[PDB]
Amino acid sequence: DFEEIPEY
Amino acid sequence: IVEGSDAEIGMSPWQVMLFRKSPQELLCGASLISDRWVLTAAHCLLYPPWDKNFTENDLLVRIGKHSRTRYERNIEKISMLEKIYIHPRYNWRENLDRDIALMKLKKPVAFSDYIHPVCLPDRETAASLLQAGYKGRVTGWGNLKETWGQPSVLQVVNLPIVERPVCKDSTRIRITDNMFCAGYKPDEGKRGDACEGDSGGPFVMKSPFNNRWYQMGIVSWGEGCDRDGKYGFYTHVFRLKKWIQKVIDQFG
Amino acid sequence: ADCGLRPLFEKKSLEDKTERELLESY
């Protein structure tokens, strides 16, 4: 899985 | 990418990752051609056979990446999509002819050491470089094998353009002038090819005349990944440039 | 334009590790 991203 | 290697930092600053919002996953490759336009394969966004019909709000564009899974904080830039434009004559019903699409970003992205646009070919660029034997470069975060895993970092592989007759004789699918194929022959020994996840990514060549990198193709389709006697097919960017320019100087 | 000239390579006159393979094929 992918690392969580912010505000986007 | 199958049988490739780890890309160097900033080696492909035009590389773009099309990222699905939910579930969070990689859906395709793409390329940066300006501060607000991204080029990719139409099948990455629209493919009815598999119930694929993404809309602008379903995806995100991640630029300046190297690591596949990590959020590269002070380096990558995540952009939202304003509008998606698929070629009007994209043939998803048959052979994926004219497999091309453009995506306009909501805001221009700032260029950096890791983010920079690739050039698009003109008539003369295509004529001198799109020749059998000449090698181009394909990049992506797609699968390492047709069936097994996945790369931790962007992968790269150089592949030679193949003679048209050989491309046609390698498949039962109808090939058009809007496609070209690349890859090594069985008797050439070397290997490599794009695979699932690499779709939409760029096939670039470095002009020996002005030393600039040009995107000559878009990863379009293939039968399996890196199979002997099979070749990867790419959208002929120059052959569809008129459409590209039309959309850009209309909604640009 | 400035398209196709990489900040960490062409702009600094540095070559990547497999660029040569492409050139030799042209």
Ligand SMILES: NCCCN1CCN(C(=O)[C@H](CCCN=C(N)N)NS(=O)(=O)c2cccc(C(F)(F)F)c2)CC1
């Ligand atoms: N992403 C939209 C839905 C399907 N797309 C169609 C295109 N596609 C593919 O072509 C994949 C993976 C190979 C990737 N590498 C290269 N050489 N480009 N190969 S494939 O699994 O053998 C394949 C699946 C469905 C259609 C095709 C056809 F378009 F050729 F008919 C082929 C990946 C899946």
